[PDB]
C-alpha cells in the first residue's frame, strides 16, 4: 500500500508521459529562434556600418 | 489531423458498432477493409490497401465484445483493439473503480498510447459511456483521470448517456450517476448529454416507429457524430474544428454540459410530401420536441449555441435564420452574452445506410447548445439519490468493496455545490 | 469463463436436478449419448459454463449428486440423460439420516461432507473463473437440509468472494409430508440467513396450485413440478449463456435486489405457463407477459405479496423484444399500484432482455421479486416450532445426538428477530 | 544398439515376466509364433534391444527364466507367448527352496548359479553395446529373493559399469503370505543397498488397493496385477525403443533422481488408469495425467509420500504433446505444495517426452518419485524383525544352514542406519 | 565466402533440422552454405531420425556423426569419458570441410548447456578448434536454462561447468532461454500450447537474418568480423541479448501496419527479448540492428534517434554512438507449416548490456545450494572430476559478476 501511494504521487509529479519530450523540444526550438533573430540583427548593424 | 474514439461498457461499444458501420458505408469501404484521402482522420492505412479504424472497444464482460468479433466486421477491427475482461462490475461503481477497474485500465492505456503515436496532428479523444452502469461509470471515470494526467491539453469529447428521469432499468443508478459526475466534472473538457427517454420519444413521434429497440437509438447517435465530424473530414463553406467547441461554448471551466439535437429526423414518407430548406430546419433544431435530453430549455437561459449544417446550404440564409431566432422571445440568452451563436456549414450531405430507418434527406442541422435547464436535471437526480442515502440502502455493497461513508458525503456536497454554481451564473 | 458448479442434495435435489440437466442439454443440442448434434454455432460458444468436453463430442455436466440412499442414485442413472453424468460425481453415503436434521448435520454429515467437498474442489479448480455455485435442496427432509446446509457453510468459508444460489422448497401446513418439518425448517433457515448470498423460496403448495389452474393438468406427478422449477433455473442463468441487448448476470441481479445483507429471500415466478387448451387462443406481446408475470396466483410461494410491500423486483426476458416496450411495462405496473411498492426507493424493478428463447415458445420471461411478505412463512413456521418446543415434543431424537437446548433457543431468536426486522423495513 | 538382457527369478519373477513379454511382443508386432507381423516401420528398427533374429524371421526374446520348481516353467511353456523362448534359456534347478532364504542363497543356489551365469554371459556378449540388465523378483520368497539377490551380486562383480534395474516387490503386514517375511526381506535389502543400481519398490497392498479404488475391478487375480507392473516396465524403457522430442535413457534417469549413492529406492505410478465404465467420460490432456500422477493414493507401494518429502521426482511422458505444458505442470506442483518438497534442491522434477504411445492409448505417463516416506516401511519391517529375533523364532531353519547371529545383527544394522539417513535428508 | 555450422546434442541438431530446412527453402549466393554441416551426438536416436527422414539424400552419409551411447545429462561423462573417443573423429572431419573451403569466415556452433553432450563435448570441441585455428571466428548460439521453467535437475552443475569454457573459447555468444521464447510464442504468436518445433523455427529466423548480409547484396552489408568489433567492448564480455520483430501471426500481420519506426521500438521492449532478463535494470553497452528487405537508410537513421532521446532505457556513459546498423535487400522467407506471416521487412537486434549480469547471479544460488550439501557430486567425481573444478568454476562466475558491476559503473 505504501509503495502504491508513492507510485501515484510520483506519477502525478512527472506531469504526464509526453511532458519531457515537449519541454526538451521546445527549448531546442527556442535555441534556433534566437539564432535566427541574432543573424537578422547583425545584418542590420553591418548594413548600417557600410 | 486525427481523432480516436474509445468505447467503454455495453452501451459504449454498441454505439461504436453503429458508428463504424456508418463510417465505412460513407467512405465506400467494404466490411472486410479494402476499397473497391479524407478517411485519414479515422482510418490508418496498412499500405497493403487495408484500412483499420482508430478505436478501442473495452468492457468488463466478454459477451457484447465477442458477437462483434464474429459479425460482418470481423476483419475490419484489429484484434488487440477489442479489449475484453473476464467478469462484470455488475452495476456497482466502486467495483468498476477500485476492485476490477485497477486491473484493466492499465492495459487500455498502453494500447491507446500507440494509437496516439501512429497519429500526427491529434485533435483529441472522444469517449462513449453510459453512467448508469458500472463499467462505463467506474473505470470510465478512472480512465478519464489517467487521461487528464497524460495529455491534459487534448480535447476529450464525452458523449455520455445519463439515466432517464422516469424510464430506468437499474435501481442503484442514482448512486452511480452522482459519484461518476463528481469526477466527470473536472476531467471531461466538453461533455454532451444523451438521455434515453428523449431518444425514445423521437423514434416514436418523428420516425413514427412504435416498437424501437436499441439499434435505432445507436443509429441516430452515429448520425449526430457524423454530422459533427464532417467539418473535420470534409471541406465546407464555413468549417469548425473540435478545438472550437472548447472555447466558443463553455463560459466557465466547470459549466460544460451541452444539450444536443438533430434535424430533420424524418421517415421515408414525410420527406416525399415535405419540403427541406435552411430556415425550417433552423427552427426544428430548437423546439424541445427534438432534444436528446429530457429537459426544457424554455425553463433555462442560453449561454451560447452551436449549429452544424450539412448538405446544399448557402451561408446567407443560415445568418437570416439565426437572426429570426434571436428576434423571437420564446427563448432568451444570458445578459452577459450579447451574441450567443456559433454557426457552421459543410458541403457533404449525410449518407444513408441500408437497413436504417433514416431517409435520404437533402439537408440537415445538428445543434449543440449550452443552457441552464441542465441544472434542473442534476437537481432532479439529487432528490432521489439523497432519498435513499440517508437510510443507507445499498451502501453496504460499495463499502464492502473498499470504500467508506466519506466519499458519499463529499461527492454529494460537491455536486450540491455545482447546483449553487449554476444558479448564480444564471442570474 | 463465467462458470457455475451445480450441487444437488437429497431426494428432492436429485429429481429437480435430473429434469434440469435434460432441459439445458436439449437447449444446447446435446443428445442423450452426450455428443453434439446441434446445428447453430451459437449453441457451442457458451457450453463452458455448464459442461466440459471429454472426447469426440462428449459433453459431461458440471454437477455433483449427493445423497444418503442409493434409490435416488439408481433412479437417476436409469432415466434418459442419465448416462451423461460422470459416475465419480455420485458422491454418496450409505446409512441414511431420515428426516432428522441432527442426523443430517452432526452424525452422517461429519463423514460424508469431506468427500463431497473434495469433489467440489476438483470441479471448482477444473474451471478458471467461478461465477458461483448452484445448490438445489429442500428444507423439510434431513439429508438435504442438514447436510446441504453444512455444505453451504463449509463452502462459504472456503470461497467467500463468489456468489451462491440455493433453490429451496420449504414446508407448509397444507403440504405436510413429515411431522418434524418445523424443527428442520427453523434450524435450516437460521444457517441460511448467515451463510447464503441469496436464496429463492419455493414451496410444493404453490406448485400444486399452478398445476391445477394455469397448467390445467390431469395428473401432475413430480415430473411436471420439477419441469417448472427447471425452467426457472434455466431462465435466470440464460444471460451468461446467450448474448442480448441488455445482459444481467447473477452478481448484477444480487446487488440490484438485496438492499440489506439479511434481506435475501426471494419469491419466483415464470411465464408463459399455459394449458394446452388455451395456448392456442393466446398472443405473444410484452403486456401479456407482464400481466401474467405480476399476477399473485402465479408466484411459486404461498406468500401473497400484496399482504406486504415490494422492496425490489426483477424480470429476465428472453426472445427478440423491443427494450422500449420492456421498460414502459415495468413503469406502468409500478405507477398504478404504487402502494404495493416501497416508497424510499424509486424504480424498484431491474429489467433485462436476452435474445434466445427456450425451445417450443417464441417469447418468455422470468420474475424475481424481493418482497417483505415472505415473513408470512417465517411466522407460519415458527408457531408450529413453538407449539412443539414449549412441550418438548420429538426433542430427544435431536438432543441425544449432540444438540442441546440453547441451539433451539438461539435458532428461535434469530428467526424471530428476522421476521421482526423484515417487519421494521416494511 | 543399446541392449537390455532380461532375467526373471522365482514364481513371482516368472509370472510377472510372462505378462511382460506378452505386452512387449504386441508392441513390436511379433506374433506368438515368433515372426514379425506389424504394420508401422517404427516397430522394426529397435527390436534388437529386446530380441535376437535367429533364422527365417524368428525373433526370440533375450530373456532368462530362473527358478527351482517346475510348476512355473510348465505353466509358462503352456500359455501363449510361451513358445517364443529358447528352451536352452530355461535354466532350472530341481529341488526347491520353499520360502527359506538360506536355501536360495547358500545351499541350492550353489549348484544353479553356475548355469545361469553361463547362459547370461553367452546371451550378454551376443549383443554389441550393452545398456544393462533387468531383473524381476520378490523379497518374501526364497528362490526369488535369495537366488536372485545372489545373482545380482555376481553380475555386479563381473560387469561393474553396466546399468541394473530391479523391479522388486516387498512384503507388508496387511498382505502377509509367509510367516518368515521379515527374516527374508531384511536380509534381501542388506544386499540390495550395495549391489543394485536402482530398485523400483512394489507391493501388493497398493496394487490390490489400486484395482479396488481406481480400476474398480471385481476379482483382481494375479494376471491384472502383473499386467499393471508390466505397463510400468514398458514405460521406463520406452525412450530407447522409440524416437521422441526429449530422450531419457536408464542412466539419464538414474543421475537425476539419486542425489546420494545409497538413496536408490523409488516409488512408481502409472497413468492413465480409469474404470471401463468411465473411460469415455474423460478427456486426455496433460493436466489430467498430472492430477492422477501426483495423487498419493496412486503409488504402487504402500507408503504414503505425503508422510515425508520428495527428494526428486521423474515423469516420462508418451504421446504427441507440447513440452511447455509439461514444464508448466511440473513447476505448478512444485510451487503450490512447497512443504512436501526438499528446500535445498530446486527443480525436483525431471521430465521427458516420447512420441510413441502404448498400444491402445493416446497419451500415458510414468512417475518415479524418490521420496523420504519410504523409510516408514523399513521401520515397519524392522519392528517385526526384532519381534522375532529378540526370541529366536524360526531362527534354526536358517542357522543350521550357515547364517550365524552376526548376519542378522548386520541386517538390522544396515536397516537402521538406512532409515536414519532418510530421516536425515528429510 | 562460406561459413560452416556445427550442431551438437539433442537440442543442437533439432535446431539445425529446422535451420537447414530454411536454408534450402531460401535458395552463386548459395555458395556460402552449399551442406557444409556436421551433426554429432552420443545418442543415435535423433541423428538416425534424419537419416531416414525426408532429407535422406540431401546430407552426405558420413556427415551425420553418431556415437554409441549417451552422456546422460552428465557434463563429466560427455567431456572426459565418452567425448574422448568421438571428438577426434568429428574435428578430423571438420578440418577437411575447411580445406574444401577457401575464404572461411568462421564456424557457428549450436548447443544447449543444460545437457551433457551439448555442454561437455561442446566445450571439448571448442578447445581443439581454438588451438587449431585461433583466428577464425566461432559464433556460439547457446541455450541456457531458464530460471523458473526447467526440465532437468543437475543442469546448474552443467551450466556453470560449461560457461567456464564458453568465456575464453567462443567469440560472440548469444543467450537464448526457453521461457522467454515460450512467452514470445504465447504473447505475440498467441500460441498457447507450443512445442520444441515452433521454438526452433524462429531461432532459425535469427540465424538467417545475421548471415543474409554475406549471402545477398544490401545497401549496407555486414560480415561476421563486423560483429567482432562493434559489440564487444572487452575481450571477456561477449554475451548478447537477442530479439526479433515482427514476430506476428498470419492474420494480425495484414491488419497491422508494419514499418521501420515501430519495429525498431518493438525490438527494444523487454516483452520481445529471447532471454528471460529485464534490461531496465541494466545499461546498454552497444546495439546492433540487422534490417532485412524494404529498408531505406533514412527511417532506420530516424529510428535510432528516437531510441537515444527516450529515457525509459539508458546507455552506458561511454558510447554516444552506441549503435551498429545493417541493411539487406532480400526479404525474409517463409516455410509452409510455419506460423510467421510474410513481411516486407524485419529486424533482428543483437545488443550487449549489464542485464546479463543478473542471470549469472540468479544462477549462482541454485548451484551454490546444491553444491554446499554435495548433492549429485558423486556422479561427476566418479566420472573423472574432482572437487577442485567445481569450486574453481564457482569463483570464475563470481569474478564475472564483479566484472559486469565494474564495467557498468
Ligand atoms: N442509448 C442507449 N443506451 C443504452 C444502450 N444499451 C444500454 N444502454 C444504457 O446503459 C445503461 C446501463 O449500462 P450498460 O452499458 O448497459 O452496462 P455497463 O455500463 O457496461 O455496466 P455493467 O452492466 O456493469 O457492465 C442502461 O441504463 C441503458 O440505458 C443502447 O443501445 N443505447
Ligand atoms: N530450443 C530447444 N531446446 C531444446 C530442444 N531439445 C532439447 N532442448 C534443451 O536441451 C536441454 C537438455 O539437453 P538436450 O539437448 O535435450 O540433451 P543433450 O544436450 O544432447 O544431452 P544428453 O541428454 O546427455 O544427450 C533442455 O534443457 C532443453 O531446454 C529443442 O528442440 N529446442
Ligand atoms: N418439487 C418436488 N418436490 C419433491 C420431489 N420429491 C420430494 N419432494 C419434496 O421433498 C419433501 C420431503 O423431503 P425429502 O425428499 O425427504 O428430502 P431428503 O430426505 O432430505 O432428501 C416433500 O415436502 C416433497 O414436497 C419432487 O420430485 N419434486
Ligand atoms: N504380483 C504378483 N505377486 C506374486 C505372484 N506370485 C507370488 N507373488 C508374491 O510373492 C510372494 C511369495 O513369493 P514366492 O512366489 O514364494 O517367491 P519364490 O518362492 O522365491 O519364487 C507373495 O507375497 C506373493 O504376494 C504373481 O504372480 N504376481
Ligand atoms: Mg541429449
Closest ligand 1 atom to Cα of B173:
27
Answer yes or no: do D249 and E376 touch at CB < 8 A: no
Question: Cell digits for B203?
Answer: 423514434
- Return the ligand number nearest the Cα of E151: 2
Answer yes or no: do E155 and D347 touch at CB < 8 A: yes
Question: What is the three-class DSSP state of E169?
Answer: helix
**Which is the catalytic residue, given B145, B197, B244, B287?**
B244
> How many other CB atoms are there within 10 angstroms of residue B417's CB atom?
10
Q: Which chains touch B (3 or more CB pairs under 8 A)?
A: A, C, E
Q: Quick one: resolution in A?
A: 3.3
* Cross-strand partners of C36: C30
> C-alpha angle E382/E383/E387, rounded to 5°?
65
Is the distance from CB of D164 to CB of D152 less than 8 angstroms?
A: yes
Q: How far is the CA of D137 from the centre of ligand 4 (A)?
A: 8
Dist CA D340 CA E201 (whole Å): 39
Interface size D-E, in CB pairs within 8 Å, comes to 100
Chain E, 298-317: which have a CB under 8 Å from a chain A CB? 309, 311
Residue B379 burial (CB < 10 Å; 0-12/13-18/19+)?
A: middle
Which H/E stretch holds residue B262?
strand B258-263
C144-160 core/surface letters (b: 16 or more CB in 10 A; e: else): bbbbbbbbbbbbbeeee
Question: Cell digits for D182?
Answer: 521379515
Dist CA E179 CA E183 (whole Å): 6
Question: Cell digits for C15?
Answer: 429429481
Q: How far is the CA of E46 from the centre of ligand 5 (A)?
A: 9
DSSP B224-235: HHHHHHHHHHS-
Is the distance from CB of C142 to CB of C262 less than 8 angstroms?
A: no
Is the distance from CB of E47 to CB of E65 less than 8 angstroms?
A: yes
User: CA distances (Å), D249 to each of D134, D243, D264, D335, in order?
Assistant: 14, 12, 17, 27
Nearest CA in chain E to D331: E149
> How many other CB atoms are there within 10 angstroms of residue B121's CB atom?
9
Which H/E stretch holds residue C424?
helix C405-425
Chain C positions touching B393 (Cβ under 8 A) are 259-260, 344-345
Nearest to B104 by CA among B151, B70, B69, B136: B136
Dist CA B416 CA C9 (whole Å): 53
Q: Which long-range contacts link C392-395 to residues 24+ away (Cβ below 8 Å)?
A: C394/C179, C394/C180, C394/C183
Dist CA B284 CA B290 (whole Å): 7
Question: Cell digits for C413?
Answer: 431468536
In the sheet where C63-66 sits, what is the strand order? C63-66, C2-9, C129-138, C163-170, C198-203, C265-271, C364-371, C310-318, C349-354
* Secondary structure (H, E, C), chain D: CEEEEEEEEHHHHHHHHHHHHHHHHHHCCECCCCCECCCCHHHCCCCCCCEEECCCCCEEECEEEEECCHHHHHHHHHCCCCCCCCHHHEEECCCCCCCCHHHHHHHCHHHHHHHHHHHHHHHHCCCCEEEEEEEEEECCCCCCHHHHHHHHHHHHHHCCCCEEEEEEECCECCECCCCCHHHHHHHHHHHHHHHCCEEEEECHHHHHHHHHHCCCCCCCCHHHHHHHHHHHHHHHCHHHHCCCCECCCHHHHHHHHCCCCCCCEEEEEEECCCCHHHCCCCCCCHHHHHHHHCCHHHCCCCCCHHHCCEEEEEEEEECCCCHHHHHHHHHHHHHHCCCCECCCCCCCEEEEEECCCCCCCCCEEEEEEEECCCHHHHHHHHHHHHHHHCCCCCCHHHHCCCCCHHHHHHHHHHHHHHHHHHHHHC
Which H/E stretch holds residue C199?
strand C198-203
Is the distance from CB of E178 to CB of E146 less than 8 angstroms?
A: yes
Helix E9-26 and helix E44-52, axial crossing angle in degrees, nearest 10: 20
Is the distance from CB of B333 to CB of B302 less than 8 angstroms?
A: yes
DSSP C128-146: SEEEEEEEEEESSSSTTHH
CB-hemisphere CA count at 13 Å for C210?
Answer: 30
Our CA-based measurement puts residue E306 at a distance from the nearest CA of chain A, in whole angstroms, of 10
In the sheet where E241-245 sits, what is the strand order? E241-245, E345-352, E286-293, E323-328
Residue C203 burial (CB < 10 Å; 0-12/13-18/19+)?
A: buried
Answer yes or no: do A16 and B113 touch at CB < 8 A: no
Dist CA E206 CA D157 (whole Å): 52
Q: How far is the CA of C138 from the centre of ligand 3 (A)?
A: 6
Nearest to A21 by CA among B234, E309, C310: E309
> C-alpha angle C153/C157/C159, rounded to 5°?
115
Dist CA C195 CA C187 (whole Å): 13
Q: Where are the alpha helices (DSSP H) in B96-213?
A: 101-118, 140-150, 173-187, 197-205
Task: Tell the residue number behind the cell numbers 484395482, with chain if given.
Answer: D211
Pocket of ligand 2 (CB under 6 A): D 246, 252; E 9-11, 14-15, 41-43, 70-73, 112, 114-118, 143, 145, 151-152, 178, 196, 199-200
Nearest CA in chain C to D362: C55
Answer yes or no: do B90 and C251 touch at CB < 8 A: yes
Q: How far is the CA of B147 from the centre of ligand 4 (A)?
A: 77
B90 Cβ below 6 A of ligand 1: yes
Question: Cell digits for B244?
Answer: 472550437
Chain B positions touching A15 (Cβ under 8 A) are 149
B169 Cβ below 6 A of ligand 1: yes
Answer yes or no: do C86 and D281 touch at CB < 8 A: yes
Which H/E stretch holds residue C289?
helix C286-293
D382-406 core/surface letters (b: 16 or more CB in 10 A; e: else): bebbbebbeeeeebebbeeeebeee
Question: Do C and B touch (≥3 CB pairs < 8 Å)?
Answer: yes
CA C46 vs. chain centroid, Å, equals: 22
Dist CA D184 CA B187 (whole Å): 85
Nearest to E133 by CA among E166, E171, E83: E171
Most ligand 1 atoms within 8 A of CB, residue of B130, B224, B381 to mutate = B130
User: CA distances (Å), D271 to each of B121, C116, D214, D286, D340, in order?
Assistant: 62, 24, 11, 11, 21
Is the distance from CB of D5 to CB of D136 less than 8 angstroms?
A: no
B417 touches chain C (CB under 8 A): no
Is the distance from CB of B331 to CB of B396 less than 8 angstroms?
A: no
Kindly calculate the radius of gyration of chain A based on its CA atoms and give it in whole angstroms.
22
Q: Which residues contact D128 (CB under 8 A, 6 or more apart)?
A: D1, D3
Cis (ω within 30 of 0) for the bond into A30?
Answer: no
Q: Which residues contact B49 (CB under 8 A, 6 or more apart)?
A: B34, B35
**Residues in the annotated binding site of B:** 10, 61, 134-135, 169, 196, 218
* Cross-strand partners of C360: none
Chain A, 3-32: which have a CB under 8 Å from a chain E CB? 20-21, 24
Answer yes or no: do A24 and E311 touch at CB < 8 A: no
Query: Closest Cα to atom 5, ligand 2: which residue?
Result: E11
CA E176 vs. chain centroid, Å, equals: 6
Dist CA E243 CA C388 (whole Å): 80
Chain C positions touching D283 (Cβ under 8 A) are 52-55
Nearest CA in chain D to C88: D278
Phi, psi of C298, rounded to the nearest 5 degrees = -115, -5
Nearest to C244 by CA among C365, C332, C163, C360: C365
Does E257 carry a binding-site annotation?
A: no
Nearest to B422 by CA among B301, B331, B319, B328: B301
Q: How far is the CA of E109 from the centre of ligand 5 (A)?
A: 16
Q: Which residues of E are catalytic?
A: 226
Phi, psi of C21, rounded to the nearest 5 degrees = -70, -25
Dist CA C355 CA C238 (whole Å): 10
Dist CA D147 CA E274 (whole Å): 57
Closest ligand 1 atom to Cα of C248:
23
Query: What was the elucidation method?
Result: cryo-EM
> How many other CB atoms are there within 10 angstroms of residue B353's CB atom?
16
Amino acid at each position: 500500500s505504501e509503495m502504491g501511494s508513492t507510485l501515484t504521487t510520483t506519477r502525478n509529479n512527472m506531469g504526464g508521459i509526453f511532458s519531457a519530450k515537449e519541454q526538451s523540444t521546445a527549448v531546442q526550438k527556442r535555441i534556433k529562434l534566437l539564432e535566427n533573430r541574432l543573424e537578422k540583427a547583425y545584418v542590420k548593424y553591418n548594413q548600417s556600418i557600410t | 489531423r486525427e481523432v480516436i474514439s474509445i468505447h467503454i461498457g455495453q452501451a459504449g461499444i454498441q454505439v461504436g458498432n453503429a458508428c463504424w458501420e456508418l463510417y465505412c458505408l460513407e467512405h465506400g469501404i467494404q466490411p472486410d477493409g479494402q476499397m473497391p484521402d479524407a478517411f485519414n482522420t479515422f482510418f490508418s492505412e496498412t499500405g497493403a490497401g487495408k484500412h483499420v479504424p482508430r478505436c478501442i472497444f473495452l468492457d468488463l464482460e466478454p459477451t457484447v465484445v465477442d458477437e462483434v468479433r464474429t459479425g460482418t466486421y470481423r476483419q475490419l477491427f484489429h484484434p488487440e483493439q477489442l479489449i475484453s475482461g473476464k467478469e462484470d462490475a455488475a452495476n456497482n461503481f466502486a467495483r468498476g473503480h477500485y476492485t476490477i477497474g485497477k486491473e484493466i485500465v492499465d492495459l487500455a492505456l498502453d494500447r491507446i498510447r500507440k494509437l496516439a503515436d501512429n497519429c500526427t496532428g491529434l485533435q483529441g479523444f472522444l469517449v462513449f459511456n453510459a453512467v448508469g452502469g458500472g463499467t462505463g461509470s467506474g473505470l470510465g471515470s478512472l480512465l478519464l483521470e489517467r487521461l487528464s494526467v497524460d495529455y491534459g491539453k487534448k480535447s476529450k469529447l464525452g458523449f455520455t448517456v445519463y439515466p432517464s428521469p422516469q424510464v430506468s432499468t437499474a435501481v442503484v443508478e442514482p448512486y452511480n450517476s452522482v459519484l461518476s459526475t463528481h469526477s466527470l466534472l473536472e476531467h471531461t473538457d466538453v461533455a454532451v448529454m444523451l438521455d434515453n427517454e428523449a431518444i425514445y420519444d423521437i423514434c416514436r413521434r418523428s420516425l413514427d416507429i412504435e416498437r424501437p429497440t436499441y439499434t435505432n437509438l445507436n443509429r441516430l447517435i452515429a448520425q449526430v457524430i457524423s454530422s459533427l465530424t464532417a467539418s473535420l473530414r470534409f471541406d465546407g463553406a464555413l468549417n469548425v474544428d473540435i478545438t472550437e467547441f472548447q472555447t466558443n461554448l463553455v463560459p466557465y471551466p466547470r459549466i460544460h454540459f451541452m444539450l444536443s439535437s438533430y434535424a430533420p429526423i424524418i421517415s421515408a414518407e414525410k420527406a416525399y410530401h415535405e419540403q427541406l430548406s435552411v430556415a425550417e430546419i433552423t427552427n426544428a433544431a430548437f423546439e424541445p420536441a427534438s432534444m436528446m435530453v429530457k429537459c426544457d430549455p424554455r425553463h433555462g437561459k442560453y449561454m451560447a449555441c452551436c449549429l452544424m449544417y450539412r448538405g446544399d446550404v448557402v451561408p446567407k440564409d443560415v445568418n437570416a435564420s439565426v437572426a429570426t431566432i434571436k428576434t423571437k422571445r420564446t427563448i432568451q440568452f444570458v445578459d452577459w452574452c450579447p451574441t450567443g451563436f456559433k454557426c457552421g456549414i459543410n458541403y457533404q450531405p449525410p449518407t444513408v445506410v441500408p437497413g436504417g430507418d433514416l431517409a435520404k434527406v437533402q439537408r440537415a442541422v445538428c445543434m449543440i447548445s449550452n443552457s441552464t435547464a441542465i441544472g434542473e436535471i442534476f437537481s432532479r437526480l439529487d432528490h432521489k439519490f439523497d432519498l435513499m442515502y440517508a437510510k443507507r440502502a445499498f451502501v453496504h455493497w460499495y463499502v464492502g468493496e473498499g470504500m467508506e461513508e466519506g466519499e458519499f458525503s463529499e461527492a454529494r456536497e460537491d455536486l450540491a455545490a455545482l447546483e449553487k454554481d449554476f444558479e448564480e451564473v444564471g442570474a | 469463463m463465467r462458470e457455475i458448479v451445480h450441487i444437488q442434495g437429497g431426494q428432492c435435489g436429485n429429481q429437480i436436478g435430473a429434469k434440469f440437466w435434460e432441459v439445458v442439454s436439449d437447449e444446447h443440442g446435446i443428445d442423450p449419448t452426450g455428443t453434439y448434434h446441434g446445428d447453430s454455432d451459437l449453441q457451442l460458444e457458451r457450453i463452458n459454463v455448464y459442461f466440459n468436453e471429454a472426447t469426440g463430442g462428449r459433453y459431461v455436466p458440471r454437477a455433483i449428486l449427493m445423497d444418503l440412499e442409493p434409490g435416488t442414485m439408481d433412479s437417476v442413472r436409469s432415466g434418459p440423460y442419465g448416462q451423461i453424468f460422470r459416475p465419480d460425481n455420485f458422491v454418496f453415503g450409505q446409512t441414511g439420516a431420515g428426516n432428522n436434521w441432527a442426523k443430517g448435520h452432526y452424525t452422517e454429515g461429519a463423514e460424508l461432507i469431506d468427500s463431497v467437498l473434495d469433489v467440489v474442489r476438483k470441479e471448482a479448480e477444473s474451471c478458471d473463473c467461478l461465477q458461483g455455485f448452484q445448490v438445489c435442496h429442500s428444507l423439510g427432509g434431513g439429508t438435504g437440509s442438514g447436510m446441504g446446509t453444512l455444505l453451504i457453510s463449509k463452502i462459504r468459508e472456503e470461497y467467500p468472494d463468489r456468489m451462491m444460489l440455493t433453490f429451496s422448497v420449504v414446508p407448509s401446513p397444507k403440504v405436510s409430508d413429515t411431522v418434524v418439518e418445523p424443527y428442520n425448517a427453523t434450524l435450516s433457515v437460521h444457517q441460511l440467513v448467515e451463510n447464503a448470498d441469496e436464496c429463492m423460496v419455493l414451496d410444493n403448495e404453490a406448485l400444486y396450485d399452478i398445476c391445477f389452474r394455469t397448467l390445467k393438468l390431469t395428473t401432475p406427478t413430480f415430473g411436471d413440478l420439477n419441469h417448472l422449477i427447471s425452467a426457472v433455473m434455466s431462465g435466470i442463468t440464460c444471460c451468461l449463456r446467450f448474448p442480448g441487448q441488455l445482459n444481467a448476470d447473477l452478481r448484477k441481479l444480487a446487488v440490484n435486489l438485496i438492499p440489506f445483507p439479511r434481506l435475501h429471500f426471494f419469491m419466483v415466478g415464470f411465464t408463459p405457463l399455459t394449458s394446452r387448451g388455451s395456448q392456442q387462443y393466446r398472443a405473444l406481446t410484452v403486456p401479456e407477459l407482464t400481466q401474467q408475470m405480476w399476477d399473485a396466483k402465479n408466484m411459486m410461494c404461498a406468500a401473497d405479496p400484496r399482504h406486504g410491500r415490494y422492496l425490489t423486483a426483477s424480470a429476465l426476458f428472453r426472445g427478440r423484444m423491443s427494450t422500449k416496450e420492456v421498460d414502459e411495462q415495468m413503469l406502468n405496473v409500478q405507477n398504478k399500484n404504487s402502494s404495493y411498492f416501497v416508497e424510499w426507493i424509486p424504480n424498484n424493478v431491474k429489467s433485462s432482455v436476452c435474445d434466445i428463447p427456450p425451445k417450443g415458445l417464441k417469447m418468455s420471461a422470468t420474475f424475481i421479486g424481493n418482497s417483505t411478505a415472505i415473513q408470512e412463512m417465517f411466522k407460519r413456521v415458527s408457531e408450529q416450532f413453538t407449539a412443539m418446543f414449549r412441550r418438548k415434543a420429538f426433542l430427544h431424537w435431536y438432543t441425544g445426538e449432540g444438540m442441546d437446548e440453547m441451539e433451539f433457543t438461539e435458532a428461535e431468536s434469530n428467526m424471530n428477530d428476522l421476521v421482526s426486522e423484515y417487519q421494521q423495513y416494511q
